[model samples]
Target: HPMEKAMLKSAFNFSKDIKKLSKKYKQADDEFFEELEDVLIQTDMGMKMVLKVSNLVRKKTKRDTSFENIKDALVESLYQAYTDNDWTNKKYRIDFKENRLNIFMLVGVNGTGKTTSLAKMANYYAELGYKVLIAAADTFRAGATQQLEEWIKTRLNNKVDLVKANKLNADPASVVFDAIKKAKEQNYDLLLIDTAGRLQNKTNLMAELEKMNKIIQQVEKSAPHEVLLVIDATTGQNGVIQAEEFSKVADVSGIILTKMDSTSKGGIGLAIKELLNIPIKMIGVGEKVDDLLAFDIDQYIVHLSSGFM
Candidate 1:
């Protein structure tokens, strides 16, 4: 929770902006509402979220002329937006099958910090005493296996092992198959498979993802418990596009948004939730292994609307 507070104070500085706007607009008027909409949109909350929050705030305070009431309305609107459904809390946790091989397939475009996110996740679960392994199924990219192996050694301190094919250009599905066999035999608690990132060619990406899914199903009918899609928070609205595209082929259970600390507009999470309706299960706040924290919707809304509080 300290990390969450730190990220709120650092990356999500919009609270201050909102407070300043609140001071500037003491009365609820057309110009005040317009500025409120502008500020919300500027935080990258997306137009849909902005409109919803703005309308909710307006409806809550049609005649009130107090700053605290307006601020509370704003916070309540944002909070309700996130907690309106079961996705916020119920589906936030990753599905890990107990007493069996749990597979988590990660998919995203290149340069979205997919590999690093996987490393962080491995470190997270390993620290919690879970037997963790990562499958380097991204053999198409040269040095992909080496990169993951290095992360296992350096980032994870050898607590985790990398399951990659011995040869380059090896079939990704074959690598996953081998990993599944190893995970089942060794009784590993979790297996995080890293697939090649390619969103440009939907056909090839779809085929590759489907093939891996089928292979995993052979070992465990309900394997690949979670298909997470990694999205770079710094990419802003582009992250929404990646989610939309990848969700078409891959059954993305949730999202792993990286580079949260590096981006000023941390509202990408809200936008993703509103636009794509995908829960962000984890987020990378910094380069350190421990910076990757499980997503908490209430805490996040508190951070975003803390100015009102």
Candidate 2:
């Protein structure tokens, strides 16, 4: 909820940038709603999301013209739309009794914060008393795995244990297989594996992802309990494209939306839900460990459009 407040502050700041344009075109209440429609479209939310926001604004304006109430009402609607699902505020802890070790496979396009998200999650669960083992499946990216290994190695210091296999340009599946075998052998409670992000790599995407999954399955049957696709919130609709692409190759269990606090385009999360019905398990608000938050529909709604009340 702290992040929601931060995100709302950022959204308000962004909205105000177009305030001058809004002021000059001010008209009567009825005319204002029509003008508001155009303003919403220009706020970098694209035409579709803006149109939806405009409709909500129109409904509120019918009852009250107070800009404060309109803002609040709009935020409430957006939050409700973005996070109408049941997983908000729900912790994504796996039930350990059924498996030797819980394996989480992280996959997505490049620049979706997969590596950073892995550390964030590792730090989160490790704090909860679960031993975490990270697999550098993204060996295809130079220094990708090392960057995360170093980050975890530095931050938690002793709280977390990391396991990385192979070097740069090695087989990603091999790295995952090694990590799972190690985790199972040592009886680790949690294993989060990061995979190569090549959503746009059309030629080898499917075949490569299948090879990775098959290798892990060979070691542990149903090993990857959770397959998460990390998405960049700023990418908007493109985020949805990435989600769709990855979902085709592997069974995507959930989402980790990074940089949510910095963007007002939280509507894309809604789009993911609206279109795919996939749950967004976590959202990153900042650089700190606590910055990552489980999705909360009510608090998020109140935070973004809180001024209405």
Candidate 3:
């Protein structure tokens, strides 16, 4: 429960560029706005959103031209960019039915902490008293499925169960089919499925995810509660592009951004929300099982925009 002030800062350490603005700009001058535009660009806030936010800041400060006034305006504008007007909900949850099995498919390219996030989720929900099971559908990777087995055995204390191929590199959909059957038979509460991420191979990736979704819908029409996009915080502009591309195939309901402990992903988060409108559901603060954090808008805003004040 690191809701501590330090936790907020640790959660998002945006670069000190905001600090530089605070020191250099005593008024909302023309040069200040231009420098602000460049700073947002350096944060990888994207061309369109950067221009939009800077313009918003300029418009906001017209009533008052003080440096503090401009700082507050910039903060408000960034917050507005994230929620727009109606996207006001500060928290989001997966669609969970009373008795129906809940499924959440985790997808992202390799090294984006896909498997680790899956295991963390498994442990988190299990602690909530939901019987959790993981389907290791990442069959193509050399040790994709094995990594889940290892997580279960080593860190999870085998409290969780995993369904994997009887042999190496079995068809991924077949593994999903087997897991669905197992979930029904065992009356499991949640089934967190893992999939291979080959974004560059767009055709194959689309076909694979399509087949997996087909199998999921056949078993439980209201399943696949969310397709969580696990993205590395440091992916910068590429992360925003990935979310757009991934959205074409899967209904990515929420984002699981990993490595919030780093400095830049904080700005990356604002960029994703501005460009994609996908809520960041959780953030990985560290590499531990309990390193996960449900996204909080207030804490996030303070840590990121506070440097300006």
Best-matching candidate per TM-score: 1
RMSD of each: 2.0, 4.0, 2.6
Top-lDDT structure, candidate number = 1
Tens digit of lDDT per residue, candidate 1, span 56-133? 899999755687788788878877766664544568888865677788988887632678888888988889888998
Tell me each candidate's TM-score: 0.93, 0.78, 0.90
Q: In model 3, which runs have C-alpha deviations exceeding 4 angstroms?
A: 1-15, 157-159
Provide the lDDT at 272 for model 2: 68
Q: Give the per-residue lDDT of model 3 (tens digit) for 219-297.
A: 8886678889887876777867876788776678888877766545456777777767788888777787877877776
1 versus 3: better TM-score goes to: 1
lDDT of all predictions: 0.79, 0.67, 0.76
After superposition, candidate 2 runs with Cα above 4 Å error: 4-9, 14-30, 42-46, 56-76, 83-100, 157-159, 167-169, 218-223, 237-243, 264-268, 274-277
Question: What does the lDDT come to for candidate 3?
Answer: 0.76
Clashes of each: 0, 2, 0
lDDT of 1: 0.79
Residues 174-222 of candidate 2: C-alpha lDDT, one tens digit per residue: 7777787888788787888887647667447667667777877776687
Error of 1 at 132 (Å): 1.3
lDDT of 2: 0.67
Look at candidate 3 and tell me the lDDT of residue 13.
Answer: 42
